[PDB]
Amino acid sequence: QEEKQRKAEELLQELRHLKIKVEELENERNQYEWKLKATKAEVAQLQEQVALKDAEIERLHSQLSR
Amino acid sequence: QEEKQRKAEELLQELRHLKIKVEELENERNQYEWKLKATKAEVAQLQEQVALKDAEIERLHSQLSR
Ligand SMILES: [N+]
Ligand SMILES: [N+]
Numbered sequence: 001q002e003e004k005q006r007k008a009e010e011l012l013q014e015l016r017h018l019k020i021k022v023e024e025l026e027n028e029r030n031q032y033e034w035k036l037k038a039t040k041a042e043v044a045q046l047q048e049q050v051a052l053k054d055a056e057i058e059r060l061h062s063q064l065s066r
Numbered sequence: 067q068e069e070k071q072r073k074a075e076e077l078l079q080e081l082r083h084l085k086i087k088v089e090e091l092e093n094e095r096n097q098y099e100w101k102l103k104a105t106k107a108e109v110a111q112l113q114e115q116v117a118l119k120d121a122e123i124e125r126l127h128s129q130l131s132r
Pocket of ligand 1: 050052054
């Protein structure tokens with residue numbers, strides 16, 4: 001039952017490694033959440049550019065039709 | 067040293083739980099990677115709409131200036 005002890009120490013090692021993995025995987029999640037946010041800000045700016053250009057096309061069409 | 071045994075079983079329980087957490091955190095990562103992809107496809111379609119509207123404004127400006 002040094003091998004009870006040995007299996008114990010094997011399991012601790014494994015716990016340590018899994019705990020580092022969980023810690024890292026929760027870092028990757030946090031930064032995916034902020035890049036998604038950033039990409040969504042890019043969508044919103046583009047929607048804003050489309051609507052400005054639609055306004056400019058409408059203005060030109062009023063003139064064009066006089 | 068039933069308590070060697072008892073601490074062993076405590077550690078297995080913990081390993082099981084951490085292994086489920088890692089499994090789930092790697093599910094959340096996979097689906098963040100695909101939502102980011104999807105959001106990026108939305109950006110690309112919008113860039114395409116902007117450029118179509120810029121082409122239409124240019125066409126109108128040529129006419130307007132005749
Ligand atoms: N728009
Ligand atoms: N453009």
